Design a protein around this ligand. Structure first.
Ligand code: NA
Ligand code: NA
Ligand code: NA
Ligand code: NA
Ligand code: NA
Ligand code: NA
Ligand code: NA
Ligand code: NA
Ligand code: NA
Ligand code: NA
Ligand code: NA
Ligand code: NA
Ligand code: NA
Ligand code: NA
Ligand code: NA
Ligand code: NA
Ligand code: NA
Lengths: 154, 154, 154, 154, 154, 154, 154
């Protein structure tokens, strides 16, 4: 089935974003492990896997709609300390949140309701799982101090 | 432990190559699935997972050596038909083979024997698993014809 | 127990033949695997194992009869394509068939009935298992065409 | 098989080093236990066992090569506080790393490839397991403070 | 992938050597059984199987490198008494050891690191398993006498 | 609890003795294995483990008493033949026996009854297990001859 | 059997001491629980049970020796904060240690070796289990601070 060209283009924009998010969580999880923060490695490794699944869902939808997926990831922006890394991932998730919301509106406009539903599922993951968790970590640092927070993530 | 700068740089060159190979097998496996060739999807999906493990091993080694991983994948070059896709993946694996062999020689020269061993393991995977399998598929097409070959991959 | 010298000599002739057949099926099975014909690899690998057992039975009988086994295999004649390999193995099995039948007659003449029985067991394997299967494969190529046959052996 | 005298001598130098490392981790693990840091006792007790296995591999190789093992351990240099003990073990592992790398080069030069492979296995353990872990602990102290770090090791 | 002609030729030299070693242990194991030394039969039968695996690894590597395997075994040199058989197998294993070491150096020179690794694995088997065991048996004969040694191998 | 300085010093003397005994049984067990005497390897490997436990008990007691353990092993004196090795280990165990008995008397004198009990446990192991077994082996050699004895230890 | 009156009297002195120690650990364990330090409650509750077993062993021995047990516990001296409670229990265990050592000497003098052995078992518990653990806790407070220590005992 040929999808609407505007929708296929927008899905491709989301795809390169998710390929990049996957890779930013790849490098951050391994950086966390390099420093001995096993709990932070485990969570970001999980979020890398979630992003790979998000990317896969978009890629498959684009092919189903007879489009050609764009596989070049967007640039990533890794941090250099734990607070910078949390903040950088939260900034990225806020960007993805806004991009997904715009995409849901566009899919509704072009009457592509299945693509809309794919994006809504990813939007709920973005808001309720990764972004919320990042906000929580930054809030814990603010409440107990960075040193106590880091101790808790060994 | 601070690694030798030339070795760290070369590992980074291999890393961006493996991130790209992962993504080329991501798109090819899903293209194969889009056309209904389940056996080709299954093999390339497996090879995508293997490439992710190769990339992970290099990334972790670079961090251990106190280097900074380069996460921008090299460009990929997907094909548009099954023969083109097999040929494109074989070309990529031949490139990776040559790059790994050069890296093993460089690691020996700089007396980084653990990095050498990591690359040798990936070299054996490259020669004996993916590249050999691709050569076999292209040889089967040549022996039984493309139509019979495609039938066998449903 | 000292065996009859003519019988021991003839068993040695069969032994060098079976050592050679083992090795011809060793190289053919791995050639089949090299090309991606897993079903042909599996059958010839099995027939290599059967030949090793045939050789072992003859070797042990020669020692029991106080003879000295000849361990130099006869020359082998591998093919270069699937039809040539099937034909070459069928030619070899026809040669072994004739040699075993001659040996059974010789054992009867010299009243070595246990050696006769060992050869009869190998003769039945030769006629009813490997040679018959090879004839069947060549007949399938003739009935469905080489390309369809090769497809079936992946 | 008589080994090359230079290689046997060098393996003996490594052996007395590993016997000493075993004993330095013996005393440090029990010191950690004496102070109530169970997690540090457990890790160093494990590393003592690993060193015993390293020493055993070298000793057996020297005997196989018809050499006579030197069983006098090198001197050890235990610390008196947790940071000093971590630093002392990291210094020792860095020394062993350099000694193994030199030994691998020497084995290659004298074409003793099996001894080279034994040393490479120990080199990978040294770099990727104990030395890396020690670097991580010292980095955790630097990131969260010594008091928080010690709390985490109870 | 086309291998380096010098490496393929050398692998073929090793292959005919391993096919011969397989057959020398075939005849010796059965000779040991013929005399009632079950423990010597069991060990040499195992070493025959190991040699078959060594030969298989070389054969498959030669095919992968697009070479043509040479399947004519080298001549064998069986002994006529238990001490002669042990000595003959030890001489053969020392020859294989030297040939493998030369091959590892040649593979390094031609930058064929996977072939090098295949040979190193076989080299370790040769030095640490069969050759060492043969040296041990000859040493036991020297320490307890041949008659006591033979009794122990029933 | 601060131990009596004379008792702590004496425990340290026993500790360096047990570290040495551990290492003498390490080298002897592997020498026995090198010659193919599996039963002698197994027993001395066990006695090496027992000595490690003896050393550990002393080391921990010294730390508990707020002393500083001495980790330099005494010199060892390995033999070069099976009878010399048995005799050398029996001489060492007789030395340890005398040293432990002296230590038990000293602990009683200084009213350190728990240290006394630790030494009594080791004394019983020394007399009733290793030393007695060594005496038995030397007696078996004397009763059946060295060649028969060695045969029994394969 | 009538015990020596001096020994029976001394065992009674130890009995009233152990009845008191039981009760001091009864009140401290429940105080720790009252404040929410579950780990400190669990350890002191265990030590209360151990003291009950110590008291039981002495009581039964006194009856066996036809003596009359004294069941009035000595006075206890509970602390009012965690550091005071640890210190008070360590002072009590040091007192019990000295009393047991004196009792062992007295039992030896009066040739009551079974009573001596009962006291030695309790002495080892006192030195190696409770007193050592208390010393460790006070040392942890000194190394990480009281606030971190208390956090670890929730
Ligand atoms: Na996402
Ligand atoms: Na996400
Ligand atoms: Na790869
Ligand atoms: Na690959
Ligand atoms: Na046959
Ligand atoms: Na056959
Ligand atoms: Na067909
Ligand atoms: Na080591
Ligand atoms: Na180590
Ligand atoms: Na071999
Ligand atoms: Na071999
Ligand atoms: Na005997
Ligand atoms: Na001992
Ligand atoms: Na002992
Ligand atoms: Na008590
Ligand atoms: Na107590
Ligand atoms: Na804390």
């Amino acid at each position: 089935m040929q999808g609407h060209p505007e929708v296929i283009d927008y899905l491709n924009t989301l795809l390169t974003g998710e390929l990049a998010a996957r890779d930013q969580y790849f490098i951050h999880s391994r950086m966390y492990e390099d420093w001995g923060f096993s709990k932070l490695y485990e969570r970001l490794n999980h979020e890398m896997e979630e992003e790979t699944q998000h990317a896969d869902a978009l890629l498959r939808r684009i092919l189903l709609l007879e489009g050609t997926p764009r596989m070049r990831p967007d640039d990533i922006h890794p941090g250099t300390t734990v607070p910078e890394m949390l903040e950088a991932d939260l900034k990225l998730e806020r960007h993805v949140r806004a991009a997904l919301a715009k995409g849901i509106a566009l899919c509704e406009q072009h009457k592509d309701f299945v693509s809309r539903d794919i994006l809504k599922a990813q939007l709920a993951d973005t808001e309720e799982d990764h972004a919320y968790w990042l906000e929580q970590q930054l809030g814990l640092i603010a409440r107990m101090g960075l040193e106590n927070y880091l101790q808790s993530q060994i």
